[PDB]
Amino acid sequence: PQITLWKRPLVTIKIGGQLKEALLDTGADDTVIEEMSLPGRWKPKMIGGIGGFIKVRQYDQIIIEICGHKAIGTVLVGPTPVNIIGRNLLTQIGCTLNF
Amino acid sequence: PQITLWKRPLVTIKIGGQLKEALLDTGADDTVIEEMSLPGRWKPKMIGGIGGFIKVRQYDQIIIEICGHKAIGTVLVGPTPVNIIGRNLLTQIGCTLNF
Ligand SMILES: CC1(C)SCN(C(=O)[C@@H](O)[C@H](Cc2ccccc2)NC(=O)COc2c(F)cccc2F)[C@@H]1C(=O)N[C@H]1c2ccccc2C[C@H]1O
Numbered sequence A, B: 001p002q003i004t005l006w007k008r009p010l011v012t013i014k015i016g017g018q019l020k021e022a023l024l025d026t027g028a029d030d031t032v033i034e035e036m037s038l039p040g041r042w043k044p045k046m047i048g049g050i051g052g053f054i055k056v057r058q059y060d061q062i063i064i065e066i067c068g069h070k071a072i073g074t075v076l077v078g079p080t081p082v083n084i085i086g087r088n089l090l091t092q093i094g095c096t097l098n099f
Helices: none
Strands: A010-015 A018-024 A030-033 A042-049 A051-067 A069-077 A096-098 B010-015 B018-024 B044-051 B052-066 B070-075 B096-098
Touching: A018 A030, A042 A069
Parallel strands: A030 A069
Antiparallel strands: A010 A018, A010 A051, A042 A051, A051 A069, A096 B096, B010 B018, B010 B052, B044 B052, B052 B070
């Protein structure tokens, strides 16, 4: 698809058996999702945004489905104001910026 | 151009006759740049991200070039961790997400 940027580029994702709305975010190195449960081992991590840093849980090898495209990658879980699909997963679905 | 997301989508911008590096950021509503001098009067603006909120100065109708594409619009100035080009100017340069 082609997604214009007149409003927030929000999509519906499937993750950990749950449906969530998330923002396609080219400024985010990684994917960060509001508090939820994910299977497997995790490591603490600090990520920095416009307002400074938040502490998150890093989960690796997590399957996500986004606009019919299934991808696998690292998902960070923590107190993010907005669910954000970052570059680590955007690449996998073949997402690019074009102008 | 087509810009893949394997690395940060960093581009050269020109603002106030000077060259700077900025991130093309679809998760940002607005464009925010590090401390610098811009002409005219400014008004107050709060912007929120991961980590919280920062106070910025809002300048309107500012000439700015992004990867050679000429735009004129709102530029925020303040303590941002990186220079960010947001949707307000991405739409001006005809930028879309494609996959
Ligand atoms: C969807 C959000 C609200 S949350 C993430 N986000 C964004 O715009 C995100 O792309 C940011 C961009 C950014 C990178 C580095 C420093 C500072 C900011 N990224 C982040 O918040 C975190 O990204 C990571 C990461 F997860 C891991 C490692 C490194 C990173 F940079 C949105 C936002 O803050 N946007 C606000 C914004 C930003 C600039 C100008 C105006 C405004 C208003 C809001 O729209």
